[PDB]
């Protein structure tokens, strides 16, 4: 395991889908808010029905 800062991991992962790294870094707070919100929606989905 090689440590890497989590934003820089996402920058590699965006570059892995042909989206240029700066499209992450210029939007990092938006992307974090979307991700954190989406995880919250999984808890609601799982809580709502078995």
């Amino acid at each position: 395991a090689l440590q890497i800062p989590f934003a820089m991991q996402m920058a590699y992962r965006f570059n892995g889908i042909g989206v240029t790294q700066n499209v992450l870094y210029e939007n990092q707070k938006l992307i974090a808010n979307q991700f954190n919100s989406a995880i919250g929606k999984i808890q609601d989905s799982l809580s709502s029905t078995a």
């Binding site: 800062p5 934003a7 820089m8 590699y12 240029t20 700066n22 870094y25 210029e26 990092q28």
Partner: protein, 57 residues
């Protein structure tokens, strides 16, 4: 453009992701976007420009 920025503690280099091979950071190794306000955790170093040593003529 490819690889990642690193420093040994004093000098900044670009290097490829899976094998340490430091290179000077240049206008050829990089691409510009935006400005210094936007990026979280950006840092200050010279970027070298291979045209200017030629235009020193």
């Amino acid at each position: 453009r490819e690889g990642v920025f690193v420093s040994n503690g004093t000098h900044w280099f670009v290097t490829q992701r899976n094998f340490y091979e430091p290179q000077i950071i240049t206008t050829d190794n990089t691409f510009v976007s935006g400005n210094c306000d936007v990026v979280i955790g950006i840092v200050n170093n010279t970027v070298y420009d291979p045209l200017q040593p030629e235009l020193d003529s």
